[PDB]
Scaffold this active site. Sequence first.
Site, mmCIF file in Angstrom:
data_model
loop_
_atom_site.group_PDB
_atom_site.id
_atom_site.type_symbol
_atom_site.label_atom_id
_atom_site.label_comp_id
_atom_site.label_asym_id
_atom_site.label_seq_id
_atom_site.Cartn_x
_atom_site.Cartn_y
_atom_site.Cartn_z
ATOM 1 N N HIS A 259 16.652 79.183 -4.476
ATOM 2 C CA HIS A 259 16.461 80.456 -3.817
ATOM 3 C C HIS A 259 15.708 80.292 -2.489
ATOM 4 O O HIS A 259 14.824 79.439 -2.376
ATOM 5 C CB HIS A 259 15.719 81.376 -4.797
ATOM 6 C CG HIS A 259 15.332 82.701 -4.231
ATOM 7 N ND1 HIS A 259 16.236 83.724 -4.037
ATOM 8 C CD2 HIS A 259 14.133 83.179 -3.831
ATOM 9 C CE1 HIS A 259 15.612 84.773 -3.532
ATOM 10 N NE2 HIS A 259 14.334 84.467 -3.395
ATOM 11 N N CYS B 275 20.604 85.175 0.093
ATOM 12 C CA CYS B 275 19.161 85.026 0.159
ATOM 13 C C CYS B 275 18.764 84.248 1.415
ATOM 14 O O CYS B 275 17.726 84.527 2.007
ATOM 15 C CB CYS B 275 18.608 84.364 -1.115
ATOM 16 S SG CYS B 275 19.301 82.755 -1.550
#
Length: 662
Positions: free
Chosen positions: A87, A10
């Site tokens: 994230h 990510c």
Amino acid sequence: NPFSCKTNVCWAKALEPILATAGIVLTGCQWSELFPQFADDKPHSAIYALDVICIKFFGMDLTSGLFSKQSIPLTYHPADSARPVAHWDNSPGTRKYGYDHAIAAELSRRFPVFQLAGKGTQLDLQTGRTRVISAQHNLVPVNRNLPHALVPEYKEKQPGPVKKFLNQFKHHSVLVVSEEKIEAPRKRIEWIAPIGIAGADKNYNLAFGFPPQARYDLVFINIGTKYRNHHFQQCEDHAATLKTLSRSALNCLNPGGTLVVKSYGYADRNSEDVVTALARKFVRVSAARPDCVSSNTEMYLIFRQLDNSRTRQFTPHHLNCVISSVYEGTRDGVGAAPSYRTKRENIADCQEEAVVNAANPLGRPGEGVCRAIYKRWPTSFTDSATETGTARMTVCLGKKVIHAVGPDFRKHPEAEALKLLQNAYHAVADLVNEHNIKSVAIPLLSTGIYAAGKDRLEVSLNCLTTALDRTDADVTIYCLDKKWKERIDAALQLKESVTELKDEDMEIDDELVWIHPDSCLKGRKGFSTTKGKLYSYFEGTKFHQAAKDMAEIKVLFPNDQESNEQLCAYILGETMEAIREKCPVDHNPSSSPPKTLPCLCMYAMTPERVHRLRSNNVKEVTVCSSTPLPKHKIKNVQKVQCTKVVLFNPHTPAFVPARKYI
Ligand SMILES: [Zn+2]
């Protein structure tokens, strides 16, 4: 699709659109070639990655401002009730990045290749050539002043027994994170290893750190990172590892505890930001390269006595000197722990390697410890003269006599005097580190006469330790009267005992910048009035240009006072090109981050203040005493005293120009 079959990228995906603004589009192989973390599918910091990519394509790091155009947010999300794990993405936030064509344009004056290169190619700033992006080139950023030396050529070695090293720490029970078993029969060892390793007490996936264990007085992180093309590159690859494992270790560490963690130094900006945040939590930090290292780039960092302080002001003067000297062979170093002691004896009889005189500006003999020092080491007074707030090294036969001149409090306002006193002590520390002095005898400066009829013991002593915690030397304080000795012993016993944390939040914030209280950046994420790092280029803000220019002026005029004089000129106009002409020689592409907190008064010279003054085209400027100027007078410059000061080391930390390795 570069991200195919990759579960933790990510951070890379998040960078993709930011790279696009610069014309950069990475393939899967290119991602893998640049980041071992990508190639091995591991969690990583998108920001660190962005710094690495910037250096690789443009041969400079993020302080250049190349990616500092505020376009696309780069946003980190901690785990919460919505998100099971942290994230990275492009969702809205105050942290943004994008290629800045203006910056690239000004850069094209020395580096025309910026204007003439094609899109998506790696630039060679020196030869002026280009190539498809390669992990084997642009190994050192040319714009960075390196905090310490690097090893010219990588050489692996057979490590000695780790037990010799662990025995240098006084704690019996030790938590060990290592890939290979460590034999220390004199210790009780809890052994954490990565997943596939047999015989361990615990196994975790160490790319994710490790969950809290019990608490120990000593934690030893032995985890290394694989060398590829360069020392700087090794630091880069190791940076996220260093932070992750250090953070996990903090959960496992008792107050007053010690953390030893394997590193390659902190060569890259991110590694240094991390080591700085980490260091802020400890009373002392030093380094060692014991016999148990497996390579010549390996360096164990030693953080001593964790109180997890918030407001501790850490500067890498000491650590830079130590690490660099070790890499260059000049030093040992090793993990015995410096200590303070007191003697009621005559300092002239001291057995310590160096003795500090409490001196006067004229370098003449006088009453005090100075009487004793002059009678035993007369020839050290041949040329002893040095300015108040400084110290001068002299040698008489087999002994180093350091003349340190404290302020006379009758001749200075209390704040300014305090700064001078602190600075005298810092200068003593500078010399101790530069000459690798193992022991030093020192008196309490400005407590005898210069004290102005008041008792300065506590404050002089506080300046002494503030400065000398930043050395590796054993310190012996010589004093005066039995009562003063009583009090000094009391203060030292208090200081040596750390039984509890000053804050319970153990996060290592390597982005946070400490700013002046009157700063307009107050409230903004990434900046704080009460804590953080003490140097910044302020890239991503409008103060960046001012910061860069101050930095360059300091590069051109290494003397602090000549530098600030030219800075006064700059505030008043005259721009840069003119000042560069005022400099006799070749410019360095690199500089050092300006200090963000030179003082607490309204005149503090921050990149912010410089920018506000210069944008208002002031016909005059006021400068405080915390911005030292030449002794003569400068037109349109009013010199005034600083009413609130800071006590850390004012000098630019020593450095190695990156150009050396390029
Ligand atoms: Zn000031």
